[model samples]
Target: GSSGSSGAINSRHVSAYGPGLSHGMVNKPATFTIVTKDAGEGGLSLAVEGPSKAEITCKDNKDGTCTVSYLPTAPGDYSIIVRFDDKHIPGSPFTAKITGDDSMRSGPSSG
Candidate 1:
């Protein structure tokens, strides 16, 4: 049996999930979910590092979970870190592969 520690949040109990966890596209919004128990919004934090700076937002769902959103500005591998009370979660430093848009370029046709 695990030791009982009151008012202590365990990193093992923290987890993140969603499509954004693995891949994303440049100039697009990516999102993921961070599930936690006992840890409140004040203690949860997220950090993203990649080719370019990304915009991040965290919204508390008020149900032991948080919605994390990030917009990547460039295409490359991004590292996402989830921390609780300054401690890294179980799967901290997640890598997200970001790619550029798939839109085709238009140019004048050469005769």
Candidate 2:
């Protein structure tokens, strides 16, 4: 846990919900719900690094959870780094294996 992060980034102190890359489809969109230990700023953001890019959206629940949604563009392995206040959370780098359309290459969403 970061010194300034309170207890927001710890796996024991936080929880993740939604469709993760470990078991999700390619064409389907991924949404994650991150719940922190406190009811305040979670400072949530996702950095995706892969052959295809993604559009990420985050919504604070005003409670202690934030919803993170992303639409993948291709079939590949994506490394999603979760950051809070620019600091990486424990196990911050989450891997996502996207499999679906082989023709879907590197580019913007074509739809």
Candidate 3:
């Protein structure tokens, strides 16, 4: 979303946002976008607690709005965490709630 960024100091601020995949596969993928500020760049990552896999665990030389993917080992509850960075420096982190149970189709859903 940005053309250029350095450290945490820039004319544009880095931000991130995402959507849920409740009806998708147990370990489906997700990608979010954030509007770029001036020539600043940004990046993001994903993490799930319990039995789900973590997305983009590493924070390195990345830029622009980042795309993180995840896959759960088994059907269960998951606590999703999203991390963002601008030129190796991170900003405020966000979290999401994801459930991977399909057998509970008839049962009440938990958001």
Best by lDDT: 1
> Global lDDT of each model?
0.81, 0.68, 0.46
Q: Which candidate do you rate higher for lDDT, 2 or 3?
A: 2
RMSD of 3: 10.2
Clashing pairs in 3: 42-64
lDDT of 2 at 82: 76
- Candidate 1 lDDT over residue span 6-63, tens digit each: 6555334677888888898988888887776545556777889899889899786778
Candidate 2: stretches off by over 4 Å: 1-15, 103-111
TM-score, each model? Answer: 0.75, 0.67, 0.40
Cα-based RMSD of the predictions, in order?
Answer: 4.4, 8.6, 10.2
Candidate 1 residues lying further than 4 Å off, grouped into runs, are: 1-12, 38-42, 101-111
What ordering of candidates by TM-score runs from best to worst? 1, 2, 3
Clashes of each: 0, 0, 1
- Residue range 5-108, candidate 3, lDDT tens digits: 55574545545555633322456554444434433444544455645565543322255444445555555545554444624223333344445555534656
Residue 41, candidate 1: Cα error in Å is 4.5
lDDT of 1 at 92: 76
**Candidate 2: tens digits of C-alpha lDDT, residues 1-111:** 456656445444344555664645676778777767452564656788876888778775777677777788787777778777666766656777777766455767787
